[model samples]
Structures are given as C-alpha cells and as structure tokens.
Target: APTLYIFPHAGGTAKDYVAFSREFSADVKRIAVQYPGQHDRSGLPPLESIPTLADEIFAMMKPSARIDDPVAFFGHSMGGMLAFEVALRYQSAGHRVLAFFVSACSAPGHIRYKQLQDLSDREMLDLFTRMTGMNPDFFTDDEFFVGALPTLRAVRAIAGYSCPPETKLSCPIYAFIGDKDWIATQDDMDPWRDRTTEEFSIRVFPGDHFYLNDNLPELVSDIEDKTLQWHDR
Candidate 1:
C-alpha cells in the first residue's frame, strides 16, 4: 500500500488533516508532517528559509518510511510548496514519488505579488483578512495576534525565499487552485507545466483560497483515483 504524506499551510498544524485522513483510506496510512512552532513541536524554533525547512523535513523523513514503496504528497498552500520541494528531495535521493497533489498554491517561481516582510502588524492583518485561508477572528484579538507574531514572522521568511532558476522534478505533478484565489491566478498556476516532464495537470475548484475544506471529499476521491491509475502504470 502507498503512503500519503500531508503538509499543512502557513501557521497550520498537523491537526488540519486529522479528519481528511480518517476519510481518505483505512488501508493507506497517512502521515501529517509537523513543522516547528505547530502542534506538539511548538516549543521548537521555526526555520526561516525554504531550503532549511526542506532539509529539516528530509532528515525527519529519512529514518521512518520505506523509500521504495509508492508514495504521494498532498499539500495545501504553504504545505503545497513544502510538498513540491520535499518530493524533489525524495526523488533526488532515489525514491519513487508517485504524484504530488498541490492545493490552492501558486506554482514555484511564479509568485509576482509584493513581499509582505516589511509590512506593519496592521497591514499584515489586513492582508491576512483578505486571504481566505486564515481565520479573521484570531487577528481580531490583540493578545492572540501578539502570541502569533513569531510564527507569522517565521512564515514570512519561509515565503520570501526564492526558488532556483533550474529547479525541476522527475515525478508527475498535479496542481489545484480555487477560481477566486487572489494569490494565484491561472497564469501563475500554468507554470507548473514547466516543472516536470511527466504528466502535469491543473484543476480549478469553486471558492477562494480555502477550497480544500469545502471540496475535501472530491479532492480525496480524485487523489485515490489518480494514484490508483499511476500505480497500475
């Protein structure tokens, strides 16, 4: 049986996929990647760059699973970014990555939006409010925002890191984005076609950036269906 790895969005915890895992498959084991400052690892210091985060996850992933088994990754937003880079790492290490299921994230190197690293707390709050993935209520409270500032700052660093010009992956890539997502337009998503020589496809779902929550059943079903086909091939 194949293993499915789950990666969460920015400031997201492993708890995000608990329900999705339950609904995915009983035969297929699900592992949620927990980053620093989230869930039980909250005490650990967060990483500031994409390479640093990817290296940390690669180290943790090395000792655990059988690298030969068919493996797939499902990542949402920031998790999607992590998923793509981690898949590249696994492929580089000689693992067979069955497929990548990217949800609501822009293609690597295609993000043209202004960097938010220099923004004030109020400005950041405004940006987060306009973004569909986060809960506005959390930012509404001064105490909560103050406590979350460190994680937010760390995520900013992660987001600001640029991808190498020639980065490419050997395995198949599947990307999904919401029709109403402001962070990623169709043109931004289309560049995923250039990332892999193997089969690459882009899908659009109804809703904004957080479409995964609303379309999870369909998403899981699609993942299972596509993975089954890939395995058969």
Candidate 2:
C-alpha cells in the first residue's frame, strides 16, 4: 500500500482528513500534514509563506518519507499549494512523487495577491466568505474569533508570497475545481497543466469551493483508480 500525504486548507486541522482517510480503506495509508499554530501545534509560530511551510514540512518528512514504495500528495486550497511545493522539494531530493492531487487552488506562478498581511477582521471575514462560504457555526462564538486571531493573521502571510520565476516541477499532477467556484475558474486552472510532463488531468465537480465535502467518495475513487496504475508506466 502507498502512503497518502494530506494537507489541509488554511485554518484547517489534521483531523479534517479523518473522513477522507476512512473512505480510502487499507490500500492507502493517509497521513495528514499538520501546520504550526493549529491543532496540536497551536503554541508554535505560524509560517507566512508557502515556501517556508514547504521547507518545514519537507524537513520533518525527509527522514522518514523516503520509503521504497510510491507516495502521493493530496491537498485542498491552501493545502494544495503546500502539497505542490512539497512534492517539488521531495522530487529535487531524488524521491519519486507518485502523484499530486490539487483542489480549488490557484496554480503555481498564477497567484494574484498584493498583500494580505494587514486586514481588519471585517475584511478577513468578507474575503473568506467570498472565497468559500463561511460556516456560521464557527463565527457564532465571539471567543472563537478572539482566540483565532493570531493564526488567521499568520496565514495571511502566504498570500503575499511570490514563486520563483523559472521554477518547474517534474511529477504527475491531478487538479480539481468546482464548476461554480468563484475563487478559481477553469481559465485559472489551465496553468496547472504546464506544471508537469507526466500524466495530467483535471476534474470539475458541481458545487461551490468546498465541493470535496459533498463529493468525497467520487474524489477518493478517482484517486484510487489513478494511483493503482500510476507506476506501471
């Protein structure tokens, strides 16, 4: 069985992948990547850029991630960007990255943000709502927002990042998007096709940005089918 490394969206925790892992069964061993300042690492300092996050994650996994069998990466939104960078780093170090599953994220070198480092609470909330519908349950408690301010502020640092102009990756890429997702459109996703020389495919599902929650089984099935025969070539 191959290992599946899962990355979460901003403000998301490793436990968010629980249902995703359960759907994959014994053939896939799911390992969720935990970022600092979230969940168990709540006290640690949060990284501001995707590259920084990638470096930290790569360092943590480099010692134990070099198994003989294949390894795949699955990331959603911010996690998707992180997964892409991590795969590139791993590949540069002579590891074989079986595949990368990116969902609802802007492709590398297409990021369009001037600065997100300084936003008022109202502005942040509006941005979140625009990208993906906000969960009212999370906003109902005033204490929740108060306690979450630090992490929220830190995650904004990723928005101001700039990818190297000539960097390219050499791994299979699988991308997904929601037909109705306003944050990322088909045009925006076309750039992902250029990220790899190996097999590349895009899946468009029905719903808003958070379509994975409603289409987990289908997504997992797609992953299983692709990964099962990935190494045959």
Candidate 3:
C-alpha cells in the first residue's frame, strides 16, 4: 500500500486537506497532519517551535504502519517547511522516504521574509489578505480570530526563523510553484534542486499562493502519477 502524508498551509486546519484522501485511490492512504489550536486539536496547546511541532507530527504519523517503505509527503506553504523537517527526521530514524512534494515554499537556505512576520497584528492581517487573499471575515469573528491566532503566530515563528537546517534528502523531490506566487517565485524554487540527489522536479501551476484550489483535478493526477511510479507495485 502506498501512503501519502499531507500538510496544510499556515493556520489551515486538517479539515482543509481532508479532501486529499478522496482524491487518491484505495491503495494510497492519504494522511493529513492537523496541528493543535485548530479543528480537532483545538483543545491541545500550540507547539510554538519547529522542533516541538515536528515532535507532535511524529506522534501523529505511524510510519511503522506504512503499507510500504518510504511514505510520501505533500505539504503546502508553511506546511511544506514543516513537512521537510518531519520527513528529514523520519529518514534519520532509518525509514525510507518515497518522495517529497512541496508547494509554495522555498527549500532550506532559500529565504526568509522575516519582516512579514513582524508586522503589527492589524498590519499582518492586511498583509495576509494582500498576499493570499484570505477572507477578511476571520478577523471579524471573535471566536475564530482569537482561537486561530496561536497557530498563525506559530507559523510566523517558522517564517522568521533565524537559521534553518540545510539538510539534503535522499528521496526524490518535487517542488511546486504557483505562477503568480510572489512568495516563492522560480528563483526561490530553484534552490530546492540541491535538496535531493535522488531526483528533483519543479512545476509551475496557473494560480497564486493557493494554486491547488484553482485546479484540483490536474494536481490530483500529477500526485497519482508520481506515487504510482515510485510505489513498488
């Protein structure tokens, strides 16, 4: 059985990526990592640092239950950064990594818009709206806004992280970029090349930041193709 682990964008709950399970076949088990302070894990305290967050994700992943060796990883935005960290640890634990699919994130040593995280709360919301076109409604909802802030700020900690590991991966890697994504343009994506000596690919889709939403079917097919080729069927 081929398994795919999915990571959602910043402040994005697991519910956001639940559809990924439906997009794949029965043979492929799609596991989405949902962090605390959002959705089902709302009761749990937020893990602020990358190391702690990665530890929590490790607990969620039953790598030993993997249907086969080297389970796949697909992460979007901040999720991409988290996925890399998580998968690197998995590899270090002596597990094989099937492949890594990262979207809207520059690989390690690529960059950091540290200023993006330091913006005033009001300014930050304005920026998120400008960058990702997030719905302005979240800010107006007292419950949702306050409750979701923990995770969002945790993600900013990741964005403004001072020094990130430059570890290279042994698994094949696919770096995706939205054609209009200013956050991770072609130049930013190119640095991912050195991350994988196995095999590396770069793909550009038609939309901005949240590109998968713009063309779900095509993205699903692309994922299936990648997994099928790698899975030892």
Candidate 4:
C-alpha cells in the first residue's frame, strides 16, 4: 500500500484529519504531520518559518520513508506550502512521489515572504471566524487563546515563506478549493499547473475555505479513486 502524508492548515493539528483519515480504504496507509508546540507536543518550541519547518520534516521523512517507498502528499492551506517544499526535497533525492494534492492554498511561486508578525487577539478572533465559519464563542474561552500561541507562530512561518516561479516538481499536482473560498480563489489555484512538469488539475467544491469540513467523504473518495489507480504501479 502507498502511504499518504496529510498536512493540516495553518494553526491546525493532525487531529483535524481524524475523520478524513478514517474514510480512506484499507489499501492506503494514512499519516498526518503534527506540528510542534501544538496539542501533546506543546513542550517543544514551535518553528516560525517554512524553510526551517520544511527542512526538519524532510530530514525526518527521508530516513524513515525511503525513496523507494510509494507515497503521496495532501496539504491544506499553509500545509500546502510545506508539502511542496518537502516534495522538492524528495525529488532532489530521487524519490518518485506519486502525486501532490493541495487544498485552499496559493501556488508556491505566488507566495511572497513578508516579515513575521504577530496577530492581536481581536485580529486572531476575526480571522478564525472568517476562515472556518466556526462560532465566535471559541475565542471567548481563555484556554483557546492560550492554545493559539503555536498557531500564531505557524502564521509567522507562512508569512516568511518564499519560492521562485521556477521551483517545479516532477509529480502531478492536483489543486482543490471551495467555490466560495475567498482565502484561495480560482485565480490563486490555477497557477499550480506551472509548479508541476507532469499533469495538473484544479477542482472547485461547493463551499468556503473550509468546505472540506462539510464534504470530507467526497474529498476522501476522490483522493482514493485517483491514488488507487497507482496502488500497484
């Protein structure tokens, strides 16, 4: 079975994909990256930039998941950038990654590096509500604010990321987004085609930035259907 590594959105943890992972077929092995300083790993310091974060993940991944192992990557939001950086590392090391699936993320070349900045509590609250469509009450809880520290750091990492338009991968790229997602519009996703030397595709679902929240089964099935074709390749 091929392995599928899942990367969560900014300020997100591996826990976010529990249900999505459960829906996959038995032939696929699922693994989700849990960013440091979040959830059970809170004791470690969180990274504040994508290059460092991506390097750490790549170093760990290369040793354990050998280049001969069949694998694919699925990353949402900020994770998409992380996945791309990691994929580039694997490609340079001679790994034949099966495919790359990115959801709700702008293309790597399109992301510009900005100075790492902190978000005010008010700004964090507003941004959370707008992105997830979750109730505002979560922000009212003090513990939730405390838990968001790593998320703030993750934002800094996202802001500090930059890649040239020439950064290309040999594997296929599949970009997904919600039709109503203002975060990553169709225009933002279309350029993903340029990031891949092989085939590229863009798919629009029927919701907002967090549309996968409502359509996990369909999304998972789509992944399974596509990856399953290469299960024994």
Candidate 5:
C-alpha cells in the first residue's frame, strides 16, 4: 500500500486528521506526525526551531518510513513546511517520495513569520479565531485553551523559522490554497514552482484558510489521483 504522511498546522495534534483520514481508501496508509512537547509527548519541551523539529521527525521516521513504498506528504500551513523538511531528508537518504502536497501555505521564503509568543492572550485568541475559523467562545474556554497551548508553542516555532533560499526538492510539488486566504495568497504560493526541480502545479479552492474542512472529498480525490499517477510513472 502507498503511504501518506500528514503534518498538521501550528497547534494541530496528531489526531487532528483522524476524521479526515477516513475519507481515503483503506488501502492507503495514513500516518499523522506528532510534534514533541504536544499531546502524549508533552513531557518534552516544544521545539522552537524548524531544523530541530525536522531532525526529530526525520529521526522518528526512519524505523517505519519504508524506503520501498510509494510515499507522499501532505501538510497544511506550518505542517507544510515541516512536511517539506521531512521530504528533503527522505530524498537525501534516497527514499522515493511520489508527491508533496502543500495546502494553505506559502513556500518557505515567503512565510510570514511573526512574534506570536509576545501576543496578549486576547490578541492571540483573536488571531486563532481568524486563522482557524473556530468559534471565538472556544478560545475563552479554559479547557479549549489548555488543549490549544501546544498550538501556541508550535505557532511560535513557525514565527522563528527561516528557510534557506537554496533549498530545493527533486519530487513533484502540488500547492493548494484558498482563493481568499490572505495569509498565503496565490502570489506567495506560486513561487513553490521554483522550489522544485521536477513537476509542479497549484490549485485554488473555494473559501478561506480552512477551506479543506469543507472540500476534503475533492482534495482527497486529487491527492489519490496524483499520487497514483506519479507512483505508477
């Protein structure tokens, strides 16, 4: 079976896509990458840099990320960058990566880094509501905020990241973004083509930053179609 690895947006958990994974065919194995210092790994401190996070994930991947399988990566927002870093590691190690699907995120150099750790609680809540399209009341709920702490830390890591301009991938790159996503506009994502030495394409979806929430069937089908075509090629 082909394998698809999923990396979540800032503050997203490994279980974030359990429901989404159900949309895929049973033959497709989906693995959700978990961030250190979050959820079950809360004993560890949340990593503050992309290099460190990448190293951790790549290290964990080696034992089970089979080199012989047709593999692909799917990431959203911060997860997109994380997925790219992991894919680079896999490529460097001579592993076959069929495709890299970067959703709702700009390519590395165009990332909008911010000092999220410095935000007031109220301001942070506002930002989360806007970015995730979640209910504002949930941000005020202590239970929700407790679960969101990990996201806060992850978003900070995203803010401090700086990608080297010379970085490139040899595999196909597929970029997805919402038509109205101000955070990663078409101009910002279009540059992803320049980051790949292989085939590259971009598709615009209806709605906002979280458009995939409503468009999963379309997104999942596209992923299946592209990965199948690439894998067979």
Candidate 6:
C-alpha cells in the first residue's frame, strides 16, 4: 500500500487528519505528523526552527517510516515546509519519495514575518480569517488558541532559514497554489521546480490561503494518479 505522511497546518494536530484520511481509499495509509506541544504531545516543548522540527520528526520516523514502500507527502503552509525537509532527508538516505504534495506555501529557506506573532490570539485569528478566507469560528476555540500560540510564535526559528535553491530533491514535486492567496503568488511557486530534479507540476485552484473546501476532488485526483499502483490489491 502507498502511504501519505501529512504535516498539519499552523496549530493543527495529528488528530485533525482522520476526517481527511477518510476521503481516500483504505489502501492508502494516511499518517499525520504531530508536532510537539500540540494535541496528545501537549507537554513536550516544540522545536523552534523548520530544520529542527524536521530533524526531530525525521529522527523518529527514520527508524520506521516504511522507507521501503511507495511513500509520498501532503502538507499545507507550515506543514509544507516540514514535508519538504522530510522528503529531502529521506531521499538523501536513498529512500523513495514518489511525490511531494504541497499547498498554500512557497518553497522553504527564507525569513518569515514576525509581525503576526505580535497579535493577540483573537486578533491574530481575525487576521488569518481576513487574509486566508478561513472559517473564523474555528479560531474561537479556547483550547486551540492557548495551545498553539507558543509554537505558532516560534517565528525566530524560521526567521533565518538557510535552504538554498541548489538544495534539490530527487522526486516528483506537486505544488497547489490558491489563485486568490495573498501569500505565495504564481511567481513564488514557480521556483519550486528548481528544488526537484525529477518531474514538477503545479495545480492552481480557486481559493484563498485556507483549506480548499470544495476543491478536494482535484486534490484527490493528483494523489490518486501519482500513487494508483498502491491500491492494486
């Protein structure tokens, strides 16, 4: 079976993947990464940088990430960076990375903004809604705000990232850009091709920076097409 290891969005947790996973067939294993200090791992301190975060995850996963199988990744925004780093790590070790599916993000290795970090939880949430077209109600959840702030504000770790254009991977890359996204414009996503030596494709969907609510079918098609052989049973 093919496996898809997913990195969650900002303030997202492994548990959030269950519903999304159900949309796919059972043969496709969906394993979601749980960042430290979130959800069940609430007590652990979350690492600060994208590199350290990927390092921590790759360490745990390296022991048994089904390296021998057809594995791929799906990440949105923050998780996209994590997924890319993980894929790079796995590929460097001579493992297989059939495809890397990313959305709502630009390629990694640059300083992200710190201004959003200064906003209070509610204020920040409001800004996210206005910018990303996300449902404002989800941000109102008490637990979500209190638990996600510390890691969310770990902007310093990402503020000085160092992956350069020459740091390329060996697998096919799939980028999903939201047409209305204020963040990664078409120009920002075009450079993703430079990060992969194999095939590179971009699927521009209609939406903002948030979940592609009605656009799951198009997303599913890309995953299924890249990994159809996994369901050959």
TM per candidate: 0.80, 0.79, 0.77, 0.79, 0.79, 0.76
Candidate 1 Cα deviation (angstroms), residue 131: 16
lDDT of each: 0.75, 0.75, 0.72, 0.77, 0.79, 0.71
Candidate 4: give the clashing pairs.
none
Local accuracy of candidate 6 as per-residue lDDT tens digits, 65-177: 65576778888877888899988898888777778887887776433454433444434555566665556444766676666556546443444455787888887788888
What clash count goes with each model?
A: 0, 0, 2, 0, 1, 0
Q: How accurate is candidate 1 locally (lDDT)?
A: 0.75
lDDT of 4 by residue, 45-88 (tens): 34346778788888777775766878888999998998988888
Please give the lDDT score for candidate 6.
0.71
- For candidate 4, the C-alpha RMSD (Å) to the true structure equals 5.3
Better model by lDDT: candidate 4 vs candidate 5: 5
Best by lDDT: 5
Candidate 1, residues 1-31: lDDT per residue as tens digits? 7778899987777887887787786456688
Quote model 2's TM-score. 0.79
Cα lDDT of model 4 overall?
0.77
Query: Which 10-residue window in model 5 sums to the lowest lDDT?
Result: 38-47
Deviation (Å) of 87 in candidate 4: 1.1
Model 4: which ten-residue window has the lowest total lDDT?
Answer: 38-47
Candidate 4's TM-score reads 0.79
lDDT of 4 at 207: 93
Q: Write the per-residue lDDT of candidate 3 for residues 1-233, one digit (tens) a residue.
A: 67788988876778887665676655677777877643442222243656677778887785444533748888888788788878887888766778899989876656665543354355446656776565656656667666665555654556554433456788888888889998778778777777777888888899999887887777877877888788765
Which candidate, 1 or 5, would have the higher lDDT against the true structure?
Answer: 5
The residue pairs in collision within model 1 are none
